[PDB]
């Protein structure tokens, strides 16, 4: 029994060992309570404003769209403290942990951004943070590992399975299975078992709410489409949520196409995977013919979910959102273009969303369209990846 619907159509659910069900029920209860509590809301808003720097800007590109009938705005989550949108929801989950009386945080991370976000929130709010990270990721993400350690978090390499993100997800759940009485599991995307897809959306929805207010102020109307990259789905659902009931507004999610869908080396399970049950949810995922879980490939480490949040699978199924893919090369060109024409260095994750907007414009340059791209993060971290290419 739950307070809220754990499913989005057929997708989602609570596919965890029985031992974890009380922890999920407790979390759901605390979240529903927090959402009705004006004091909780005021504390969250205060952190978002005075610590994280909300609201974030909405920047009109003019140089990129010159000579076309596209108007393009970027929602600047790159300017949030930490350099990515992840900060919003970690602050909310840290406050939930405290509401429940928990003093310890468990988190998973692949690229390391969620690990850093979790560690910064834990440092601020007096929580003891431990972060699981696949040993292969630890090796290749020294900067982020050092950041986590500087902020007082314990980073625990995971050597099991493929020693990457899914393995760290497993390890976080194994730990929580034994430690839930004192620790909160700070899941890093809008995926996993209910109530996480719901909580993460609600703690990211200020992205879309602000965008709506800002675009109305500047343009006097809603966007024709909002466009966001899709790793696990958090930044995208945060942008989409407040527009779902605005039927005229297109919602476009961009999965990583990697080396190209046809190569099999991609991270596009929503459109090119197969529904499975893993990490607590029923959702499209990257899996072998026999049902073994596989990795997602992308030039961008942050798009390295081997599945997708269930609400995205649902919005796709009913046709409310459309999902597309962008290859490594397309993302790299968008990265370079934004740097040169707007003086903004975007995350390679976010570069996938920008690349699709650029295609929308270039393919149909006389189509009048008002577009918003969610610029989910900054790309300082990516300069050496891009350099090496």
């Amino acid at each position: 029994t739950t307070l809220l619907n754990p499913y989005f159509g057929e997708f989602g659910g609570m596919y965890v060992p029985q031992i974890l069900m009380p922890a999920l029920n407790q979390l759901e209860e605390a979240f529903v309570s927090a959402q009705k509590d004006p004091e909780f809301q005021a504390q969250f808003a205060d952190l978002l404003k005075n610590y994280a720097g909300r609201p974030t800007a909405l920047t009109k590109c003019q140089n990129i769209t010159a000579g076309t009938r596209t108007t393009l705005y970027l929602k600047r989550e790159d300017l949030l403290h930490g350099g990515a949108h992840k900060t919003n929801q970690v602050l909310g989950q840290a406050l939930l942990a405290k509401r429940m009386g928990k003093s310890e945080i468990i988190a998973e991370t692949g690229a390391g951004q969620h690990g850093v976000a979790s560690a910064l929130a834990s440092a601020l709010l007096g929580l003891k943070c431990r972060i699981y990270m696949g040993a292969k990721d630890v090796e290749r993400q020294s900067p982020n590992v050092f950041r986590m350690r500087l902020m007082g978090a314990e980073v625990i390499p995971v050597h099991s399975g493929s020693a990457t993100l899914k393995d760290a997800c497993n390890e976080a759940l194994r730990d929580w299975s034994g430690s839930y009485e004192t620790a909160h599991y700070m899941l890093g995307t809008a995926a996993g078992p209910h109530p996480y897809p719901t909580i993460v959306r609600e703690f990211q929805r200020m992205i879309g709410e602000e965008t709506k207010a800002q675009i109305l102020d500047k343009e006097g109307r809603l966007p024709d489409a909002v466009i966001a990259c899709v790793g696990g789905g958090s930044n995208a659902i945060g942008m989409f949520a407040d527009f779902i009931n605005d039927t005229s507004v297109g919602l476009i999610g961009v999965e990583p196409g990697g080396h190209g869908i046809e190569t099999g080396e991609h991270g596009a399970p929503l459109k090119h995977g197969r529904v499975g049950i893993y990490f607590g949810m029923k959702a499209p995922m990257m899996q072998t013919a026999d049902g073994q879980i596989e990795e997602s490939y992308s030039i961008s480490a942050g798009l390295d979910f081997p599945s997708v949040g269930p609400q995205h699978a649902y919005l796709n199924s009913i046709g409310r959102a459309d999902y597309v893919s962008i290859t490594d090369d397309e993302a790299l060109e968008a990265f370079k273009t934004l740097c040169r024409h707007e003086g903004i260095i975007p995350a390679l994750e976010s570069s996938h969303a920008l690349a699709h907007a650029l295609k929308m414009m270039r393919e149909q340059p006389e189509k009048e369209q008002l577009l918003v791209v969610n610029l989910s993060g900054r790309g300082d971290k990516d300069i050496f990846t891009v350099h090496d290419i």
């Binding site: 060992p17 029985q18 399975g161 194994r174 073994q292």
Partner: protein, 268 residues
């Protein structure tokens, strides 16, 4: 079939508990795994719990994580597991055989089709580790349509509502978890909460088997004394495989000695 019912009736007649080892199918290879399983049976296993190697065993600690990895290193697939299961049943007609599954392997080719394959090879039960009673409906329905017992888990903290559901929905045996956390011999759980064991009997649940952290004869004896029908031991068995990888004959001798001792502890 009614293999668990027949087993528990026979054991009750002898005032005896069940000892039930777990191993991963195909660890460390198909041929050695078949020999391991025959050894477990010859040494006195009353039933088996057998894991199909899965990429992401999130209810398992390091010992069993490593068993899954060894089976994969040997190229073991679910289809090969089913071939193994058919042969095990052809050799041993009465021993109850339970599978330890993760949901994606059951859902992969279709839930109904999975349970149909289980019936074809002569499996008796399926425990899907990451499907709680709350999500269990399509799994338990398919199990029952194919004469397979769906196994459910009773945590030590189980409230009355959960006990009633586990009692109603399960068949074959009820899994009594010794503790929170994941599989592992390095972490010993509690004595079967007598209150849970008694409530399960009141609700006419399938007989209880206690599992997690069961590594010693003294724990087997204690489980039975507390009112459980028996005990399951996985990591302790798998540790013997791991320790003796280079010595397959010694591996079988050590397995035989350990299982014999654990089974002896279950006797009245």
């Amino acid at each position: 079939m009614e293999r668990y019912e027949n087993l528990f009736a026979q054991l009750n007649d002898r005032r005896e508990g069940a000892f039930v080892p777990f191993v991963t199918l195909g660890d460390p290879g198909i041929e050695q795994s078949l020999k391991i399983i025959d050894t477990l049976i010859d040494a006195g296993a009353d039933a088996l719990e057998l894991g199909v190697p899965f990429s992401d065993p999130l209810a398992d600690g390091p010992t069993i994580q490593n068993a899954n990895l060894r089976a994969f290193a040997a190229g073991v697939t679910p289809a090969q597991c089913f071939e193994m299961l058919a042969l095990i049943r052809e050799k041993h007609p009465t021993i109850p055989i339970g599978l330890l599954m993760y949901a994606n392997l059951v859902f992969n080719n279709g839930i109904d089709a999975f349970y149909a394959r289980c019936e074809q090879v002569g499996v008796d039960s399926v425990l899907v580790a990451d499907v709680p009673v709350e999500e269990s409906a399509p799994f338990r329905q398919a199990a029952l349509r194919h004469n397979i017992a769906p196994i459910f888990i009773c945590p030590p903290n189980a409230d009355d509502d959960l006990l009633r559901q586990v009692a109603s929905y399960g068949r074959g045996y009820t899994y009594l978890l010794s503790r929170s956390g994941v599989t592992g011999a390095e972490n010993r759980g509690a004595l079967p909460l007598h209150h849970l064991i008694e409530k399960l009997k009141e609700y006419h649940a399938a007989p209880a088997l206690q599992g997690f952290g069961i590594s010693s004869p003294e724990q087997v004896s204690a489980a039975v004394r507390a009112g459980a029908a028996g005990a399951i031991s996985g990591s302790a068995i798998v540790k013997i495989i791991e320790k003796n990888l280079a010595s397959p004959k010694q591996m079988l001798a050590e397995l035989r000695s350990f299982v014999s001792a654990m089974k002896a502890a279950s006797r009245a």
